[PDB]
Structure 1
Amino acid sequence: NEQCSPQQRTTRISGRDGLCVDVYGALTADGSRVILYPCGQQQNQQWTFYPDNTIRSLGKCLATSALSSGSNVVITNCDYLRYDDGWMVSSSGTMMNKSSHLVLTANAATSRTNLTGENNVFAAKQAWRIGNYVEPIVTTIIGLRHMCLEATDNDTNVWLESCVKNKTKQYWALYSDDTIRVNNNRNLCVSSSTDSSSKLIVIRRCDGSINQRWVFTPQGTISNPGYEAVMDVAQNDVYLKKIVLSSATDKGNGQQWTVFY
């Protein structure tokens, strides 16, 4: 009965590179800006969610500051939002202002940045994990023929190999920004091709792009929502050593994956 209608929950919000959503300097004036900052236990990184679709820290509401893209996300007196529909968080961690459709974004070339309301392109820098546990989740990723994804060729390529417990290059760090990182080189991300001639999924330097945003779906796929495609084993043949981005299709089993943590 009452457990079906939780009245609030206080948690943290982490995203790009595992940093936290942070009211800068714990300032409380209306329009005080929100940034990314290393995660900690400070009050200015505690966000309380309420069933009115507000998201609050230091008693005030997370909000966009403009109707068009590129302005800061701020906190402001929640009474200023009385006739506002608030925030909607998608199942894939997109945080959207319901009215403007702008999404919470860490847009700069660095992670050490002001957070802004931008047009959604499903970039990794627009992906968020709302939750108190902010760390990357270390896991193997199991796919066709019960095999494990492995980082190969000095961490530039990725394909399926027989699972070997503790084999270093078969471990992945699942970050709050929906990136899939090489566990012992967390500056490298699984990436869809940046060359339009190739559909090959590779490993590249983490850069916040659409190419690097991956969603583990309830239907068992690894989806790139920006590119409306999923990870697939080339020709449903693990011995080809190629994982590609493809449109979703239930012809074989090469689009099925799960996590074994």
Structure 2
Amino acid sequence: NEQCSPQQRTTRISGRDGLCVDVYGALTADGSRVILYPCGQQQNQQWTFYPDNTIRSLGKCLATSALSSGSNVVITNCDYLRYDDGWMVSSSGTMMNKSSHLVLTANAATSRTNLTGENNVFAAKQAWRIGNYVEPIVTTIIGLRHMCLEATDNDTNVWLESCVKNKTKQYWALYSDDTIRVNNNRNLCVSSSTDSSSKLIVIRRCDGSINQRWVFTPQGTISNPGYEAVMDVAQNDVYLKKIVLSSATDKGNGQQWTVFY
């Protein structure tokens, strides 16, 4: 089956705030930098993947420019990277230089922001969707007792309520940066607690942090990989109106979730 060994594929890479990985001005010189930029059909947002672990736009290779954190990711001649292992993408969308362990990162959300190779901390600003379809995915999120997450208290809290199809606040926009956004106000992100004395999951202004990065795992959990923990119904009791961050256990059903889209 030659289908099992695809020779290449051309796609986009979208990340923070739904913006795209873009070679600035489509410049083709060795070391021409990659940036955040609104998604479109332009050649310099087109990334071709290969079995050799190279990611290419404009015939050249996505790369780091430095062994230490803080420097731009660029495109360079692919011949230069002839003896390097290249990129590895984790199943959560972390794009990592195999050798240096540095990861594709967006230190700000605005258009034209320089992408840099940074130390991995599982922030949302380090989370990428590799894929031609770059739009947020609108969904309901179904948990315990078949109830829906609802955004509450003027979009400041979140908990389970009986699912209602019309209901605006039960709709969630799943961004390419692994954020879970209030559909109706996409500046607002579902966030793990910032007060250490609480585990309460809440809604806050999107900021690219570890607290706002979520992963829908094949095993039915909603994971925050940075905090090695998962979204959970407090005490397996939906009537407590509280969703917390917990270690992954099989003791109840409160760590099980479904996406309905």
Q: CA RMSD in A?
A: 0.7
Structure 1 position 147, deviation (Å): 0.4
Matches of 1:83 and 1:110, distance apart in 2: 35
Indicate conservation of the 8 Å contact 1:17/1:111, yes or no. Answer: no
Matches of 1:251 and 1:184, distance apart in 2: 34
Matches of 1:62 and 1:144, distance apart in 2: 43
Deviations 1:6-28 (A, max 9, x none): 00000000000000000000000
Matches of 1:134 and 1:238, distance apart in 2: 33
Classify the secondary structure of the residue corresponding to 1:125.
helix
Classify the secondary structure of the residue corresponding to 1:226.
helix
Deviations 1:108-134 (A, max 9, x none): 364641000000000000000000000
Indicate conservation of the 8 Å contact 1:129/1:177, yes or no. Answer: yes
Residues paired across the two proteins, number:
261
Structure 1 position 180, deviation (Å): 0.1
Structure 1 position 51, deviation (Å): 0.5
Distance 1:19 1:257, change over 3 A: same
Matches of 1:166 and 1:118, distance apart in 2: 42
Classify the secondary structure of the residue corresponding to 2:231.
strand
Deviations 1:20-77 (A, max 9, x none): 0000000000000000000000000000000000000000000000000000000000
Deviations 1:170-195 (A, max 9, x none): 00000000000000100000000000
Percentage of identical aligned residues: 100
Whether 2:76 is the aligned partner of 1:80: answer: no
Structure 1 position 166, deviation (Å): 2.0
Matches of 2:236 and 2:111, distance apart in 1: 37
Classify the secondary structure of the residue corresponding to 2:190.
strand
Structure 1 position 107, deviation (Å): 1.1
Q: Which runs of 5+ in 1 are unaligned?
A: none
Classify the secondary structure of the residue corresponding to 2:227.
coil
Q: Which residue number corresponds to residue 234 of structure 2?
A: 234
Indicate conservation of the 8 Å contact 2:16/2:109, yes or no. Answer: no
Q: How does 1:56-95 map to 2 (within 5 A)?
A: 56-95=56-95
Q: Which residue number corresponds to residue 130 of structure 1?
A: 130
Structure 1 position 5, deviation (Å): 0.3
Matches of 2:199 and 2:64, distance apart in 1: 36
Matches of 2:189 and 2:128, distance apart in 1: 16
Matches of 2:12 and 2:249, distance apart in 1: 36
Deviations 1:126-152 (A, max 9, x none): 000000000000000000000000000
Matches of 1:97 and 1:57, distance apart in 2: 17
Matches of 2:106 and 2:90, distance apart in 1: 17
Indicate conservation of the 8 Å contact 1:16/1:111, yes or no. Answer: no
Deviations 1:174-229 (A, max 9, x none): 00000000001000000000000000000000000000000000111000000000
Q: Which residue number corresponds to residue 55 of structure 2?
A: 55
Q: Which runs of 5+ in 2 are unaligned?
A: none
Matches of 2:155 and 2:123, distance apart in 1: 22
Matches of 2:240 and 2:232, distance apart in 1: 12
Matches of 1:62 and 1:167, distance apart in 2: 43
Indicate conservation of the 8 Å contact 1:157/1:201, yes or no. Answer: yes
Classify the secondary structure of the residue corresponding to 1:207.
coil
Matches of 1:162 and 1:100, distance apart in 2: 48
Classify the secondary structure of the residue corresponding to 1:52.
coil
